[PDB]
TrEMBL record:
Transmembrane segments: none annotated. Disulfide bonds join C5-C25, C9-C21. The chain holds residues 125 to 152 of 362 of the full protein. This is L-2. It comes from Triticum kiharae (Wheat). Residues 1-28 form the Plant antimicrobial peptide domain.
């Protein structure tokens, strides 16, 4: 799930870290 893995990114305060973690999940 894209939302499942993405939810973990929300834990990161660094917006830049959330992006990499988000997109990184898809097409991995």
């Amino acid at each position: 799930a894209d939302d499942r893995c993405y939810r973990m990114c929300q834990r990161y305060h660094d917006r830049r870290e959330k992006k990499q973690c988000k997109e990184g999940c898809r097409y991995g």
